[PDB]
Amino acid sequence: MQIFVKTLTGKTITLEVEPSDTIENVKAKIQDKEGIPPDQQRLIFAGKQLEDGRTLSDYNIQKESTLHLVLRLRG
């Protein structure tokens, strides 16, 4: 199934995932496309930040859903 990841710069990332995919797997797929390391990614769905060890189905994130990406890197 496909889900969308929207970034603060207005970009939209399309991902192929499964309900059993963990949030870490989603962050790994974001790393494959964007190069952003998982430990720098903050994924938010419906106003809540998502936990790495939990799965997509645990958060009831279904197909065509839109996740938000916030980056942590500071300097």
Binding site: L8, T9, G10, Q31, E34, G35, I36, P37, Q40, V70, L71, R72, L73, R74, G75
Partner: protein, 152 residues
Amino acid sequence: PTVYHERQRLELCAVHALNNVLQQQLFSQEAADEICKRLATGNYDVNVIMAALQGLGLAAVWWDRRRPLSQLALPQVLGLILNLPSPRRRHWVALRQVDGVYYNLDSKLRAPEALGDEDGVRAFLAAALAQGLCEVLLVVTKEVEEKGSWLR
């Protein structure tokens, strides 16, 4: 009796890195703060840097640390903004080519440090990445981002 502790004023490294990678005093603390408002001191995140470049039709591509540095087409890149640790604490640093010679334009330096050609800065990046806790951002045009021509 508590502990009195005077601290240095912030370094504004994000602003100096933006300006050094663009070779022009374009951004300021006021521009950075203005950008940081609409995304919701002196410790600006990578979102601010990305938005700052986006306002100029540019973009920051995040380099995958897993890729070999040989796959990085440095000539296609306007410059590099690094995030290095400062002995935690981190700071932003610009690397930029001028007339074919790459320089480490770290705002904490007293003068730019010449790195040489692509091999020299590639060894610099490899030595910076092997140290750990190093993130490499590629400053490129929107066209180079769309084409992915930063990747050789």
